Known about the structure:
This is part of a larger assembly, with 3 copies of chain A, 2 copies of chain D and 1 copy of chain F. In chain D, 30% of the residues lie in helices and 19% in strands. Chain D is an alpha+beta fold.
Amino acid sequence: FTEYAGAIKTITSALQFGMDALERGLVDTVLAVKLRHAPPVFILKTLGD
Amino acid sequence: ECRSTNNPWASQRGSLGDVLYNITFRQTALPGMYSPCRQFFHKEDIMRY
Amino acid sequence: HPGFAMTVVRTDEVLAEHILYCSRASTSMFVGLPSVVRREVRSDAVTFEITHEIASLHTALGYSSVIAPAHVAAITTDMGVHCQDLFMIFPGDAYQDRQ
Amino acid sequence: ALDKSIVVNLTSRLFADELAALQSKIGSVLPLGDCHRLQNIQALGLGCVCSRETSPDYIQIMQYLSKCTLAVLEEVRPDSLRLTRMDPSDNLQIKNVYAPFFQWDSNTQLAVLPPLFSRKDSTIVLESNGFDIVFPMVVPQQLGHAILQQLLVYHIYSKISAGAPGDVNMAELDLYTTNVSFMGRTYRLDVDNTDLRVLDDLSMYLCILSALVPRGCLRLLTALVRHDRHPLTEVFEGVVPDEVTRIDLDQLSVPDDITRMRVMFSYLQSLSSIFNLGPRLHVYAYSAETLAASCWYSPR
Amino acid sequence: ALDKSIVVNLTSRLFADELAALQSKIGSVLPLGDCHRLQNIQALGLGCVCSRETSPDYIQIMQYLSKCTLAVLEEVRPDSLRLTRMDPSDNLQIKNVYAPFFQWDSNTQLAVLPPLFSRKDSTIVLESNGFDIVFPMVVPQQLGHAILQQLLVYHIYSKISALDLYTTNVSFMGRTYRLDVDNTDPRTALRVLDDLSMYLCILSALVPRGCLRLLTALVRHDRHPLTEVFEGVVPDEVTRIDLDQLSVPDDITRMRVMFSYLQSLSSIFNLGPRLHVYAYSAETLAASCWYSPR
Amino acid sequence: QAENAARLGRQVLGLLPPPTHRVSLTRGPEFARGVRDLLSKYAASTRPTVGSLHEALRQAPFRQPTYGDFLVYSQTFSPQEPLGTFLFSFKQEDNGSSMDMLLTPTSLFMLSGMEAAKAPQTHKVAGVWYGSGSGLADFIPNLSELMDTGEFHTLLTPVGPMVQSVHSTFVTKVTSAMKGVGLARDEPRAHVGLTLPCDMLVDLDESCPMREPAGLNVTIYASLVYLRVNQRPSMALTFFQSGKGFAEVVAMIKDHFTDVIRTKYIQLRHYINRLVFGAVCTLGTVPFDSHPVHQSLNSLPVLVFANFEAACGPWTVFL
């Protein structure tokens, strides 16, 4: 029984590892979208006027 | 405007500087190294802009 | 002094820390619905994937994200004096005689 | 129950003109350096090895071919490609878009070859992302070792003729090289009179083995001599020439042969390993006007 | 479906030294003979062909290596061993240990070789049963082929003597390793040399007259990476064969029939099985591969 | 007829590939119960019973090979075949849209026209199979040239066992078999072996042990010898059978064809294209220590090999 409990306390943890890893890609890629459309300040100041 | 070119060894088209660091005449080398003078003499990347 | 003189190039890189500004409502995201896919069967390993495709968008037409270099942390590449060994970049090209 | 699928992403969208070159093929063969389902462009063509900048290569392709993992296109979208993985002894469908065009044949054996022709035959030039796509030469096996052989002959006599053209007629040469004979058909190749740096190193390797191999079996005959030694060796006197067997150890010495014979056999394995196996898939059925086929892939 | 696991009956209890010897190697490759669930200890190791009081060679071992199955350890219990098994197409988790250390990567290429450096390290004594257990060694083919290179070269010279800084120092770049040669059985490598007798005489006949002519236009004019072997001197043999004029359709026959015997030389530079490793880790020293009978 | 839908709806909807295991996440930790054919250790008791283990045998590997349907004249492929032979595929040229040519090992003994006593068992039956070599040698008018330049092994693409010959008057439909184990058509749930003549087979792993280990693999190799007899070149064939490994077998084959070579190279001497000898093509792996049960014909001793998978190969030269 308490070897079977060592199964369900393993696989339901390794699902939650994918729950975090899903939320990392939301923080990562949305940030990594913004860095492919971001000129530096020394371009955008003279063009911004 | 008074001088046409500083050296005829880089901006001259056939010149030894331009030939050592051209992409067209590097079909012998190992590509794994890095070369900075490769950058300022590359015909394409300058004309990409 | 030989017959010529020479210019020298180097490179350098600097680790730096940025203030990245991002304005409001620049993008609208389309969050998908994830899935669990198995592959690469071993004697023991049943490796999975949790894949989740998400579609982005650019709402405004102007620029909406500005980066700035605002720190120097180190100078990682050191401005050495070591030249570049053209015998190693060109192993093929050599002279005529052996000795 | 397994699920293979490989999705290659692109940072920028495709051109509307390049996408017509990628709708033009829908099932082909890609050497794919990944074994996963998310990937950037840099490991599906041959741009890992075969690139525009350096010299073209043969064995660095050929080592990379069998080491790699092949895949087949399914559904090309403008954002991003899509593939299907090639499992060992999987079964799927293959069409051709392989310039220059070779007509297939059912119930044949298929080798995957390095491209050695021009880029207009070989590639689709990308400009959305700068990196290439290079498609491997997919030609059946007997036709692979005939297109290899006559060009490798054409490479050796080119170096002689460029060095000294007082030996070789180009009319005698070009009549007997660019016409591959099989099927009752003559398939004409591309000759490359631009001056062929794909087949340099084989001609470099085989010309070591032209002179230094027949030095070899002379030394072997005087090694371990028995009244029990295997008897087929007497028969092979007539194979080796009479002029070869009048050479002694006078020109060399005791440290000279060690500097040879340890290195001598190492050329034979770098020779014999690559010409045995390509990654081969067997095709049993085929049709002409559909240009479709069914395959199974033996990693060999 | 399918299970694969081999437990070994160990009929006499371990000793305190030999327990830690097996405990020292928890991920290993030993070839056994009887593919069953249970197994007696007359045929676990390789030692049926490489023993102490005998004079073992290594060709007959490597010849015996391809017949055998291959197996990986799971535990070492005091009263019994426990192993696991390798199907002829199955991915697994191999975890390399082997003491003349090397480093691999993803997409590397392997062989299985006998112990060719230290029998005393690779074997362990089993005073509990009086029967030792030889361990073989996995080596990448960049050097695993190179170790096979010298043995064929080695038995050539040592009978002509009937010194050896030259022969069995196996060259990795920066690491030259002296082999293990004390009491060889040169009879099995003799037949392999008898099969090098054939092809190396066969290839000598129909040598291309064009590619011979390239050498006089090689060492005289230009210089190359390979041609340091010649030191810019043509052999005397080239000056005898290239007297005539060249002719392509004579030579294509000498270029295709040559190419046939090129493929035939796989049959003598053989291996045991090959192992195509696809995934690899550094600090765990884990790897993964699908086994390939060959 | 309304209950004929409920006869195909049962079978076809169960006779499917297993689905790609793809569970959406929002369920949660129920994904793991799809994995069933990776467990292999079922719990027993004092009373285990087939009525309660009927899941434990319900699991099975996904094993299914493929067939290549051919189409050949009954003038060459004989009307009688013992349902487990071997098939070549000679292929010279695309004349028709689909005009194949098969060859059996019984056929090649008539194409070659080798000596009687070198294979004196099938030769008695090789005249009640076919003619005298008329209806076969007239389809390839370069057989004398295929011997001399040494190119016949470069054209055979081996196929494997049979499944069924739906035979007709002129052209025989032949359902071939590759990749593995051919399923029968007269009898369902019954595989089809590969059956060979005892004249052609030559064993390899037979000596007094005076011990070779066990294993899973034992292979059947195909072979071929370009030779000349009575100053007119006619090819040859044997088989092989070993579970040894390719490093031994080429050295072991040369022990068998020693005496042919010892006569042969007297002939050309007393050339360049004459020098090639033969090749080896692996025809798949017999399972370990399964026995060949002998058979006979009207007679002709024929073996059998049950559970025979079949994987082809290339033609590597040996000499």
